[PDB]
Amino acid sequence: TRKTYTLTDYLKNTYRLKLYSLRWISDHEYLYKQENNILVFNAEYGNSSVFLENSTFDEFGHSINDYSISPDGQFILLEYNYVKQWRHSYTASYDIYDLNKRQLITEERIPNNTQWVTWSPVGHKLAYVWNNDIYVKIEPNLPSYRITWTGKEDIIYNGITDWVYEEEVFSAYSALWWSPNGTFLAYAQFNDTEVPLIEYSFYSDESLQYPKTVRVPYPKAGAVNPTVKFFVVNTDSLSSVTNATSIQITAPASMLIGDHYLCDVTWATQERISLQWLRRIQNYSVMDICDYDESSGRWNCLVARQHIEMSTTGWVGRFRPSEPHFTLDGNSFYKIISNEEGYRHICYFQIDKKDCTFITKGTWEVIGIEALTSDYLYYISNEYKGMPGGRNLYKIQLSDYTKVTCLSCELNPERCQYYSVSFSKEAKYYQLRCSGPGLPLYTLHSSVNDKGLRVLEDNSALDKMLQNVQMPSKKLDFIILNETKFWYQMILPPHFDKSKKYPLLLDVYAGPCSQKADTVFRLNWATYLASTENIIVASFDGRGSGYQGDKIMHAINRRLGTFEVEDQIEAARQFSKMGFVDNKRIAIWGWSYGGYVTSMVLGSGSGVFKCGIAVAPVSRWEYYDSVYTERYMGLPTPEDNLDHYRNSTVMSRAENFKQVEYLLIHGTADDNVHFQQSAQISKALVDVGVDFQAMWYTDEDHGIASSTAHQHIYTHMSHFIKQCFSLP
Amino acid sequence: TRKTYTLTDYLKNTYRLKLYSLRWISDHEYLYKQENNILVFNAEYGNSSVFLENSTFDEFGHSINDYSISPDGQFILLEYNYVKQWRHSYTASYDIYDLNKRQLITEERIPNNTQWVTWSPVGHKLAYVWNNDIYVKIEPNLPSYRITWTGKEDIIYNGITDWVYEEEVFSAYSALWWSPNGTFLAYAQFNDTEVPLIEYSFYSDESLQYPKTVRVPYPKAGAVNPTVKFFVVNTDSLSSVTNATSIQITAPASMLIGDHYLCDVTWATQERISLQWLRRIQNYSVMDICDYDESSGRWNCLVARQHIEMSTTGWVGRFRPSEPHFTLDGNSFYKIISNEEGYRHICYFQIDKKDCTFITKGTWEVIGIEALTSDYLYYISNEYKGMPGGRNLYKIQLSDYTKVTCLSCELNPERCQYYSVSFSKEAKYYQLRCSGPGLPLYTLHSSVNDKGLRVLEDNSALDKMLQNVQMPSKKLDFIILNETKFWYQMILPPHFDKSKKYPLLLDVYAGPCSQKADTVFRLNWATYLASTENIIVASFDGRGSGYQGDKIMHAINRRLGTFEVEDQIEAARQFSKMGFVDNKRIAIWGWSYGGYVTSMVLGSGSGVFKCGIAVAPVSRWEYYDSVYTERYMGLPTPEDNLDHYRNSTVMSRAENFKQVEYLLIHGTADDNVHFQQSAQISKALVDVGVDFQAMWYTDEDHGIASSTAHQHIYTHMSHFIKQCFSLP
Ligand SMILES: *[C@@H]1O[C@H](CO)[C@@H](O[C@@H]2O[C@H](CO)[C@@H](O)[C@H](O)[C@H]2NC(C)=O)[C@H](O)[C@H]1NC(C)=O
Ligand SMILES: *[C@@H]1O[C@H](CO)[C@@H](O[C@@H]2O[C@H](CO)[C@@H](O)[C@H](O)[C@H]2NC(C)=O)[C@H](O)[C@H]1NC(C)=O
Ligand SMILES: *[C@@H]1O[C@H](CO)[C@@H](O[C@@H]2O[C@H](CO)[C@@H](O)[C@H](O)[C@H]2NC(C)=O)[C@H](O)[C@H]1NC(C)=O
Ligand SMILES: *[C@@H]1O[C@H](CO)[C@@H](O[C@@H]2O[C@H](CO)[C@@H](O)[C@H](O)[C@H]2NC(C)=O)[C@H](O)[C@H]1NC(C)=O
Ligand SMILES: *[C@@H]1O[C@H](CO)[C@@H](O[C@@H]2O[C@H](CO)[C@@H](O)[C@H](O)[C@H]2NC(C)=O)[C@H](O)[C@H]1NC(C)=O
Ligand SMILES: *[C@@H]1O[C@H](CO)[C@@H](O[C@@H]2O[C@H](CO)[C@@H](O)[C@H](O)[C@H]2NC(C)=O)[C@H](O)[C@H]1NC(C)=O
Ligand SMILES: *[C@@H]1O[C@H](CO)[C@@H](O[C@H]2O[C@H](CO)[C@@H](O)[C@H](O)[C@H]2NC(C)=O)[C@H](O)[C@H]1NC(C)=O
Ligand SMILES: *[C@@H]1O[C@H](CO)[C@@H](O[C@H]2O[C@H](CO)[C@@H](O)[C@H](O)[C@H]2NC(C)=O)[C@H](O)[C@H]1NC(C)=O
Ligand SMILES: *[C@H]1O[C@H](CO)[C@@H](O[C@@H]2O[C@H](CO)[C@@H](O)[C@H](O)[C@H]2NC(C)=O)[C@H](O)[C@H]1NC(C)=O
Ligand SMILES: NC(=O)c1cccc(-c2ccc([C@H](N)Cc3cc(F)ccc3F)cc2)c1
Ligand SMILES: NC(=O)c1cccc(-c2ccc([C@H](N)Cc3cc(F)ccc3F)cc2)c1
Ligand SMILES: *[C@@H]1O[C@H](CO)[C@@H](O)[C@H](O)[C@H]1NC(C)=O
Ligand SMILES: *[C@@H]1O[C@H](CO)[C@@H](O)[C@H](O)[C@H]1NC(C)=O
Ligand SMILES: *[C@@H]1O[C@H](CO)[C@@H](O)[C@H](O)[C@H]1NC(C)=O
Ligand SMILES: *[C@@H]1O[C@H](CO)[C@@H](O)[C@H](O)[C@H]1NC(C)=O
Ligand SMILES: *[C@@H]1O[C@H](CO)[C@@H](O)[C@H](O)[C@H]1NC(C)=O
Ligand SMILES: *[C@@H]1O[C@H](CO)[C@@H](O)[C@H](O)[C@H]1NC(C)=O
Ligand code: NA
């Protein structure tokens, strides 16, 4: 009898998924790390050479965390002393290595504790942020030119985002953008002077006698938000003037009338930049297209080139207005926007004309635009077989929109239905990355004739190992409710028998625009639960979920904690009505937004669930950040949506928890969903006399991802689920 | 056939013990509150009169927390708007009511948020502290005189103690001392300027959007301590035109050479005050006796009147040097000190003579001196039947120390073995309070011939109720370890059958000078565990425990976390050998110092215990406060005792928790044993991969005493223990 996929296998990663992470350095070459050596591959023929011997930095004296080669291939940036901060931010030390001279540069080194660094897109200029100010080095070994003098810890951020912009707007720490050929450096400046601070203790190593109080400018719903300004500086003038001028580009009048955000920055040409602004009430955004005026050294944004994007049913964009993809001459661009039917498709815009033309349409959506050439636009969508949880690469002829070719749909339909892509510099080649439903498969292709060049990694090694394991199977299907299809997936135990009644665990996230039902292959906790514990693990995408049109996504507008919660309960009812589920053993669990939904469900009094686990749950919307919360909930004031804010808390459902078994878990150093959120849930449960299980994780953040805490939490949850389901 | 004592009985106080709290107002009468009415009783005859109508304040508007009648009976201080701070501190509002004119005083009233207030010992002067400064009122309706002007929140404390002095030295918030007739007012001033602050979050009500950060000057072991100064002001010469002059009394030179503390202030006569000072290395103390000089208006403390108290085996006193009891003329005093055998007895001192004479002796100890007349000294001791856990009242003839008479031993030996007492103003009468082993008994006596006047409260009502309940019994006995006896007690289930095997729960505290084996009657969690769950609850007093001499108490000097932990394991090992104990079901639990011992025991690898519960445990001595910790551990420096500070942590024993079930509990707003202590334990366990159970209590402090949290924690621990013992 073959072994099963156990908890230890998951926690120790015995069955390793292989991937193929390459870095395009040109239009026909990429870098790949093999046996700690950096190799350079020729896409066309597959042959290669050693770009940088693994013994190059054996006496560097430091473990190198990452590297970055300059665009011209002349230097390599070495990152070490990596210190993580939030989801994307971190600080580190950097050294620059001269490839040609094969020497490390020791003069005018990048400062320690540097917050962000980036090469110019062409050549080898560098821009970095240190102590919240921007610096530019024209040459690696020469002195830096300071660009800003206003930087101030926790107050003024130049070229880097503050906490909320990093997490909710840019999903990046950097807030600087080099123009295409490197002449200009654009950047944002955030001012958090009046933004309130979240404070929590950090205990650190046992040797620290007094706990440290961490303080972070973080605007909770309805609080004072950071303000923002945008500037552009000409780096080519740096060595000619003592102090180069940063030219400010002001937001439009329609934005200046109230609170607003800078939400996108995209260069069009060497002398034209586009910026998108979003009002604090996130259903109105404006894009300005600004040109450099060589006679005045200023940037002007013609109103005739301004584009408005608004929404009558919800917020704008999936999580923010989408980015534009400009044609080479910068006179037109393509952008994903929702059409009249509520589905996101690609629209073609002339920069000085307000009405655009949709080039794709249908009851499916475009996920992203991947590359644009003079003759073709490449994009990823879920059109294939009408499966919203699938992803394929398509090519559309710019001179004839009726000519659309799916480049990945039929490569291996049974094994591959979820693709992402990586194009070379001028799109001459592309790497396809299949991530499911079968084992991930990485392949290389030539754009000139769309022919497959070779398989890069097929995971045959893993497939061989899994042959001797009783793996679970995955079912992806839908149920019809109110004439609408809603998709779900089920991880089913080996030798599934529909004549038996299996316990069921509902794995939930369900946040706005989320998707938990897809064709991706995963080896995770659910794999062990189904394989070893014979538990069915299901997920359902109901109202509020994404990639299926606005009608579904905007159903929860201004009403978080309602339909998305109700639909998970209904999904459980539908699953029990399938005949192979033990109604007496239905559990539910979720992390983050999933923890909020899990808690709301356990406190609904539905009687459908026996037990549930919430990890780092949101508990009341006024405790979460402004940008994310307000996008879906508006403002917490009597004149706007305060009543629903107060009506959608977990605490108000405390009494109903007497009907279930609950495990509440939270990391004490969670900078995202503050420990405070679970602290209030527990106090409300204690106040009504409800017993429950709890676990805090000292110094862990929203990811509870340290190696030991990760193993500890899944082990703890495994015992809780096995006990609730009466499993040996 | 009858009911047992249930968890609900304990949590809802179904069976209440009646008390008889009286307040002596002279040598012949006392005040007693009955039906909200304050009555005055004549001690000789037992007749009473109404002193103050319960309705007198029907329209007061505020809920009165407590009351305090001036010594001359002319006024009554009304306390309301009570707001608790630490163990003893709190702030409140006050109003003074004139009893003669039956009117509430409205002129010059005591401010709101007053930190401390007290009537002078004679008459009706008042002294109060507000905003950290001292004020004095000669008449209730007249304006107050500002005595100090340096008061500053969290920095300068005049007349009130800072956190550490409140908890560890004076066991009180008050740092004011009126002279016998009220002429002088002595006070201490604490300076916490350089004391580090402990910081932690307070979540408050759900409505608070951002958690609050509490900051408290708290010196952990080895950190900078507050400094202290002492002053005396003459309240009979106060002027409303000039600021009051406070005369400072400086500490002796042997104290000023290094860090030190003020540990006792006791007035001897109208013009003589004694003060005891203690070195930061708590084995050297000095008492100064100071006399007022009418000519200079200064206070002089003659070196010839200095008395040194030191210890070569440990620290000085049980928790601090004991208080002196001066004779009427103030020329001599009686004080409890450790004799040459290491047993605490009463020594008689001449104020200007170095050698004192012990007036009691034996292998037992005097607990406290209770009253002194020219012919007799009254004291409580555990001499009777050689039981260190028993307490009786004795009197010794000052003219012949061989004449010692026990006054409570034979009153009712079967019901009463643990007494405390309350003497009238001139020791003419005394109230005896028996607290066990039977139900509490309160009686009144006359000193002239020790007549038993009457029974004040015999709890016959409770006795009648308990007759219908299957109550547990208590066994007090000893085991011998190395020729030394150590006492233990066992709460035994109803109908205890020595032929059956019972699970056993070891209830531990075990801090230095602690005593957990005694003759006190208690209705608590253990009562329920024994009565309803048939669990034997045991407690043992090992090395380090009190009231049995320094040989036992000082055994753990400079060595916390060693002998006291080992002795609990040895006791359990012995109890497990007994025929009526199921060695497969032995558990252990403790709170505070008891949580530390429980944790050190569970991490010892002894294999004796199946499970255990630690509530608000200390985990590393460097995290606890200086005054208490250093008293037993010295300083955490390599030159002193750092190695043992580092070897006595719970964290270092994490690996050994793999074979036990552990439940760790802690209140997040614990200002005494910071949450930090449990946060480091959990992280250590996560780091070695040990699973355990946890529960935090939002906003609860060291007492986890709020009504809902109290019920919740005992409910949670009860489930944990029953589950560990496989009990229905
Ligand atoms: C891959 O193999 C090709 C063919 O051998 C290499 O082609 C070289 O191309 C350069 C142009 O830059 C010509 O001057 C040479 O004739 C070719 N090399 C030699 C040694 O003759 C190519 O360099 C190889 N690429 C890698 C990364 O190894
Ligand atoms: C960041 O924003 C703050 C306001 O929140 C600005 O501070 C004000 O600056 C003006 C101009 O000197 C002063 O008169 C005010 O007293 C300041 N107000 C506050 C609340 O500090 C600040 O100038 C901005 N900083 C930058 C670099 O833009
Ligand atoms: C470079 O130019 C900037 C912009 O003029 C200077 O920044 C100003 O500095 C003055 C005085 O130090 C302040 O009053 C202004 O508020 C600053 N403006 C900004 C936008 O920061 C900067 O000091 C100059 N650096 C040097 C070396 O001259
Ligand atoms: C990058 O683009 C910039 C902007 O077009 C170029 O700078 C201009 O160069 C022209 C010469 O062709 C000059 O007449 C202008 O004065 C320059 N404008 C500015 C703002 O500098 C720049 O030459 C390009 N860089 C490279 C390497 O091609
Ligand atoms: C309380 O005791 C003080 C000190 O002995 C008394 O004050 C003294 O009173 C006499 C009058 O007989 C004066 O000669 C002294 O100068 C006073 N000394 C001081 C320091 O004031 C006071 O009278 C006593 N109070 C009561 C009510 O007996
Ligand atoms: C009070 O206790 C301290 C510490 O135990 C004693 O001081 C010295 O402590 C060090 C270790 O920290 C020893 O090496 C010394 O032998 C101790 N004695 C001296 C004089 O340094 C101190 O002796 C104790 N005081 C009394 C009166 O016993
Ligand atoms: C208790 O009883 C005595 C009587 O024995 C009361 O009487 C004493 O005090 C009265 C005023 O308080 C006087 O009117 C009596 O003359 C006096 N008698 C004696 C013998 O002392 C006494 O007041 C009563 N005390 C209380 C508190 O009610
Ligand atoms: C309380 O203690 C502080 C610190 O010991 C006293 O201030 C002293 O220390 C300062 C630095 O912290 C020095 O700059 C000063 O010279 C010294 N004195 C003063 C007045 O600052 C402080 O005075 C003390 N306060 C009181 C009322 O005693
Ligand atoms: C302390 O607070 C109390 C209650 O607020 C004060 O009492 C009065 O409160 C009323 C409202 O209830 C106010 O309008 C008055 O101003 C307060 N004072 C008086 C005299 O009525 C009280 O005054 C405060 N303590 C002090 C010393 O002012
Ligand atoms: N920047 C983008 O365009 C973009 C593109 C894809 C996804 C996202 C994205 C989506 C969700 C977030 C939320 N902070 C996730 C989240 C939700 C919550 F309730 C509690 C905690 C939490 F962490 C943050 C960023 C952003
Ligand atoms: N002031 C006195 O003379 C006196 C008399 C009797 C008892 C005490 C006394 C005894 C112990 C304390 C300790 N802070 C108790 C304690 C110990 C610990 F590890 C963790 C927390 C904690 F809370 C505080 C005061 C003091
Ligand atoms: C490069 O370094 C690695 C260390 O991880 C070593 O194992 C490998 O053999 C080296 N490369 C070659 C070609 O030997
Ligand atoms: C970075 O800091 C380290 C540690 O102090 C120091 O040794 C090194 O010289 C610094 N490097 C630079 C470039 O400043
Ligand atoms: C944007 O949202 C606000 C709040 O619901 C609403 O009042 C306003 O009309 C909306 N604007 C549009 C164009 O829908
Ligand atoms: C005073 O009020 C209490 C209310 O708790 C009442 O029981 C008592 O009878 C009242 N006093 C008198 C003398 O009636
Ligand atoms: C009393 O002392 C304080 C503080 O030094 C001062 O402000 C006040 O004016 C003084 N009052 C008199 C009457 O001297
Ligand atoms: C005596 O007994 C104690 C415990 O009571 C033990 O620690 C010690 O080693 C024994 N021997 C001596 C000489 O103290
Ligand atoms: Na009697």
Q: Residue B713 in 3-state DSSP? A: helix
Q: Give the chain A residue nearest B619 (alpha carbons).
A: A206
Ligand 9 surroundings by CB, under 6 angstroms: B 111-112
A150 C-beta closer than 6 A to ligand 3: yes
Which of B135, B129, B137 has its CA nearest to residue B113? B129
To test the pocket of ligand 16, the residue of B156, B240, B243, B245 to mutate (highest count of ligand atoms within 8 Å of its CB) is B243
> Count of CB atoms within 10 A of residue A236's CB?
14
Q: At what angle do helices A563-576 and A593-602 cross, to 10 degrees?
A: 70
d(CA A689, CA B473): 31
User: Do A562 and A452 share a structural domain?
Assistant: no
Q: Among residues A133, A670, A671, A701, which one is catalytic?
A: A670
A564 C-beta closer than 6 A to ligand 10: no
Give the tokens for residue B158. Answer: 């005049």
Spell out the residues 6+ positions from residue A218 whose beta carbon is closer than 8 angstroms to its own: A163, A164, A195, A196, A197, A198, A625, A671
Cβ(A525)–Cβ(A714) under 8 Å?
Answer: yes
Q: List the helix and strand counts (H, then E) for chain A.
A: 12, 46
Give the tokens for residue A113. Answer: 């504790």
B149 C-beta closer than 6 A to ligand 16: yes
d(CA A34, CA B326): 88
Complete edge-to-edge strand list for the sheet that includes strand B64-69? B64-69, B75-84, B90-98, B103-104
Distance A55 CA to ligand 12 centre (A): 8
Interface with chain A: mutation pick from B200, B206, B707, highest number of A CBs within 10 Å = B206
d(CA B621, CA B315): 17
Q: Among residues B435, B592, B599, B678, which one is catalytic?
A: B592
Secondary structure element (H or E) that encloses residue A9, with its range = helix A7-12
Which residue's CA is the nearest one to ligand 3's atom 11? A149
Give the tokens for residue B422. Answer: 């309350």
Quick one: A181 exposed, middle or buried, by C-beta within 10 A (0-12, 13-18, 19+)? Answer: middle
> Count of CB atoms within 10 A of residue B193's CB?
12
* Residue A489 CB-half CA count within 13 A: 23
CA distance B224 to chain A (A): 13
Q: Residue B719 in 3-state DSSP? A: helix
* Domain C-terminal end among A436, A459, A482: A459
Which of A608, A577, A581, A576 has its CA nearest to residue A500? A581
Q: Do A203 and B623 touch (CB under 8 A)?
A: no
Q: Is A644 an active-site residue?
A: no
CA distances from B177 to A9, B144, B185 (A): 70, 18, 6
User: Do A315 and A254 share a structural domain?
Assistant: yes
Q: What is the DSSP letter of B121?
A: S
Give the tokens for residue B330. Answer: 């103030």
Cβ(A655)–Cβ(A243) under 8 Å?
Answer: no
Which of B264, B671, B645, B211 has its CA nearest to residue A211? B671
d(CA B693, CA B713): 13
Q: Which atom of ligand 17 is nearest to the CA of B543?
A: 5
Residue the block writes with tokens 């950060």: B213
User: Do B475 and B348 share a structural domain?
Assistant: no
Q: Do B683 and A699 touch (CB under 8 A)?
A: yes
Q: What is the DSSP letter of A657?
A: G
Angle A234-A238-A242 (CA atoms, 0-180°, nearest 5)? 125
Residues from chain B that touch A664, judged by Cβ atoms under 8 A, are none
Angle B410-B412-B413 (CA atoms, 0-180°, nearest 5)? 70
Which of A721, A715, A698 has its CA nearest to residue B696? A698
Cβ(A387)–Cβ(A478) under 8 Å?
Answer: no
Q: Do B696 and A716 touch (CB under 8 A)?
A: no
Q: Cα B361 vs. chain centroid, distance in angstroms? A: 26
SS (H, E, C) B142-208: CCCEECCCCCECCCEEECECCHHHHHHHCCCCECEEECCCCCEEEEEEEECCCCCEEEEEECCCCCC
**CATH classification at residue B123:** 2.140.10.30
Cβ(A673)–Cβ(A702) under 8 Å?
Answer: yes
Which of B260, B258, B273 has its CA nearest to residue B169? B260
**How far is the first Cα of chain B from the last one, in angstroms, to the nearest whole number?**
19
Q: What is the DSSP letter of B360?
A: -
* Domain C-terminal end among B410, B434, B459: B459
Q: Is A72 an active-site residue?
A: no
Angle B646-B540-B585 (CA atoms, 0-180°, nearest 5)? 90
d(CA A134, CA A190): 13
Q: Residue A181 in 3-state DSSP? A: coil
d(CA A145, CA A523): 49
Residues from chain B that touch A701, judged by Cβ atoms under 8 A, are none
d(CA A266, CA A320): 14
> Count of CB atoms within 10 A of residue A714's CB?
17
Q: Which of A203, A687, A696 sits opposite B694 (nearest CB)?
A: A696
d(CA A246, CA A280): 26
User: Do B25 and B142 share a structural domain?
Assistant: yes
Q: List the helix and strand counts (H, then E) for chain B.
A: 12, 46
Which residue's CA is the nearest one to ligand 14's atom 3? A281
SS (H, E, C) B478-501: EEEECCEEEEEEEEECCCCCCCCC
Q: At what angle do helices A707-724 and B675-687 cross, to 10 degrees?
A: 90
Residue the block writes with tokens 């040598």: B27
d(CA A646, CA A653): 12
Q: Residue B707 in 3-state DSSP? A: helix
d(CA A107, CA A124): 16
Cis preceding-peptide flag for B493 (omega within 30 of 0): no
Q: Which of A676, A691, A696 sits opposite B211 (nearest CB)?
A: A676
Spell out the residues 6+ positions from residue B306 whose beta carbon is closer than 8 angstroms to its own: B252, B286, B287, B288, B289
Cβ(A65)–Cβ(A80) under 8 Å?
Answer: yes
Backbone breaks in chain B (C–N > 2.5 Å) follow which residues?
none
Q: Residue B58 in 3-state DSSP? A: coil
Beta-strand ranges (E) seen in B515-580 are 536-540
Which of B380, B381, B388, B457 has its CA nearest to residue B423? B380
> Count of CB atoms within 10 A of residue A294's CB?
8
d(CA B369, CA B334): 8
Distance A474 CA to ligand 3 centre (A): 61
Residues from chain B that touch A694, judged by Cβ atoms under 8 A, are 694-696
Residues 692-711 on B with a CB inside 8 Å of A are: 693-699, 708-709, 711
Residue the block writes with tokens 């013609």: A302
Give the tokens for residue B611. Answer: 């499970």
Cβ(A127)–Cβ(A238) under 8 Å?
Answer: no
Q: Do A686 and B693 touch (CB under 8 A)?
A: no
Q: Residue A467 in 3-state DSSP? A: coil
Strand A227-234, strand B392-397: pairing: unpaired
Secondary structure element (H or E) that encloses residue A716, with its range = helix A707-724
Range B441-472 burial, b when 16+ CB lie within 10 A, else e: bbbbbebeeeeebeebbbbeebeeeeeebbbb
Q: Provide the residue type at B524 as one letter.
A: N
Q: Do A199 and B209 touch (CB under 8 A)?
A: no
d(CA A489, CA A483): 19
Cβ(A570)–Cβ(A543) under 8 Å?
Answer: no
Asked if A719 is an interface residue toward chain B (Cβ–Cβ < 8 A), one would say yes
d(CA B547, CA B513): 7
Q: Which of A199, A683, A691 sits opposite B715 (nearest CB)?
A: A691
Compute the CA torsion angle A103, A104, A108, A112 (nearest 10 deg): 170
d(CA A115, CA A130): 6
User: Do B677 and B604 share a structural domain?
Assistant: yes
Distance B42 CA to ligand 7 centre (A): 8
Phi/psi of residue A85, each to 5°? -120, -100
User: Do B297 and B207 share a structural domain?
Assistant: yes
CA distance A268 to chain B (A): 42
User: Do A537 and A410 share a structural domain?
Assistant: no
Spell out the residues 6+ positions from residue B420 whose beta carbon is closer than 8 angstroms to its own: B380, B391, B433, B435
Q: Residue A690 in 3-state DSSP? A: coil
Give the tokens for residue B270. Answer: 């109208």
* Domain C-terminal end among A429, A459, A489: A459
Question: What ranges in B392-506 are assigned the alpha helix state H?
Answer: 460-466
**How far is the first Cα of chain A from the last one, in angstroms, to the nearest whole number?**
19
CA distances from B203 to A589, A665, A688, B168, B214 (A): 26, 17, 18, 27, 10
Cβ(B124)–Cβ(B93) under 8 Å?
Answer: no
Complete edge-to-edge strand list for the sheet that includes strand B451-457? B419-423, B429-434, B441-446, B451-457
Ligand showing the shortest atom-to-Cα distance for residue A108: 13
Cβ(B421)–Cβ(B430) under 8 Å?
Answer: yes
User: Do B684 and B586 share a structural domain?
Assistant: yes
Q: Provide the residue type at B313 as one letter.
A: T
Dihedral sign, CA of B100, B101, B102, B106? negative
CA distance B231 to chain A (A): 33
Residues from chain B that touch A220, judged by Cβ atoms under 8 A, are 209-210
Residue the block writes with tokens 């300083």: B635
Residue the block writes with tokens 């005593």: B515
Give the tokens for residue B694. Answer: 């946890």
Q: Which atom of ligand 6 is nearest to the CA of B641?
A: 12
d(CA A667, CA B193): 34
d(CA A363, CA A383): 8
Give the tokens for residue B140. Answer: 């209730």
d(CA B602, CA B724): 14
Q: Which atom of ligand 12 is nearest to the CA of A53?
A: 1
Residue the block writes with tokens 């400046």: A189
Which residue's CA is the nearest one to ligand 3's atom 12? A149
Which of A626, A635, A641 has its CA nearest to residue A261? A626
**CATH classification at residue B510:** 3.40.50.1820
Spell out the residues 6+ positions from residue B548 whose beta carbon is closer than 8 angstroms to its own: B365, B388, B541
Q: Is B95 an active-site residue?
A: no
Q: Which atom of ligand 8 is nearest to the CA of B191?
A: 1
CA distances from B169 to A695, B254, B319, B427 (A): 36, 20, 8, 28
Cβ(B180)–Cβ(B267) under 8 Å?
Answer: yes
Distance A553 CA to ligand 14 centre (A): 17
User: Do A523 and A455 share a structural domain?
Assistant: no
Cβ(B337)–Cβ(B365) under 8 Å?
Answer: no
Q: Among residues A592, A606, A619, A718, which one is catalytic?
A: A592
Give the tokens for residue A712. Answer: 């500890």
Experimental method: X-ray
Secondary structure element (H or E) that encloses residue A528, with its range = helix A525-531
User: Residue B562 sits in which domain range?
Assistant: 1-13+468-728
Q: Do A683 and B698 touch (CB under 8 A)?
A: yes
Which of B517, B476, B467, B475 has its CA nearest to residue B496? B475
Residue the block writes with tokens 């906003």: B699
User: Do B488 and B570 share a structural domain?
Assistant: yes
Which of A306, A157, A326, A317 has its CA nearest to residue A230? A157
SS (H, E, C) A494-505: CCCCCCCCEEEE
Which of B323, B327, B325, B347 has its CA nearest to residue B337? B347
User: Do A281 and A381 share a structural domain?
Assistant: yes
Quick one: A269 exposed, middle or buried, by C-beta within 10 A (0-12, 13-18, 19+)? Answer: middle
Experimental resolution (Å):
2.0
Q: At what angle do helices B563-577 and B593-602 cross, to 10 degrees?
A: 70
Range A342-366 burial, b when 16+ CB lie within 10 A, else e: bbbbbbbbebeeeebeebbeeebbb
> Count of CB atoms within 10 A of residue B726's CB?
9
Q: What is the DSSP letter of A654?
A: G
Residue the block writes with tokens 């192979």: A580
Give the tokens for residue A492. Answer: 């089913």
Q: Do B686 and A693 touch (CB under 8 A)?
A: no
* Residue B353 CB-half CA count within 13 A: 10
d(CA B544, CA B559): 10
Q: Residue A520 in 3-state DSSP? A: coil
* Residue A332 CB-half CA count within 13 A: 12
Cβ(B295)–Cβ(B353) under 8 Å?
Answer: no
Asked if B200 is an interface residue toward chain A (Cβ–Cβ < 8 A), one would say yes
What's the number of domains chain A is made of?
2
d(CA A317, CA A565): 23
Asked if A198 is an interface residue toward chain B (Cβ–Cβ < 8 A), one would say yes
Ligand showing the shortest atom-to-Cα distance for residue B52: 15
| Bridge partners (DSSP) listed for residue A232 | A186, A247
Q: Cα B254 vs. chain centroid, distance in angstroms? A: 29
User: Do A306 and A441 share a structural domain?
Assistant: yes
Cis preceding-peptide flag for A437 (omega within 30 of 0): yes
Which of B217, B155, B148, B147 has its CA nearest to residue B191? B155
Q: Which atom of ligand 9 is nearest to the CA of B93?
A: 1
Q: Cα A669 vs. chain centroid, distance in angstroms? A: 21
d(CA A306, CA A291): 12
Length of chain A: 728
Cβ(B280)–Cβ(B225) under 8 Å?
Answer: yes
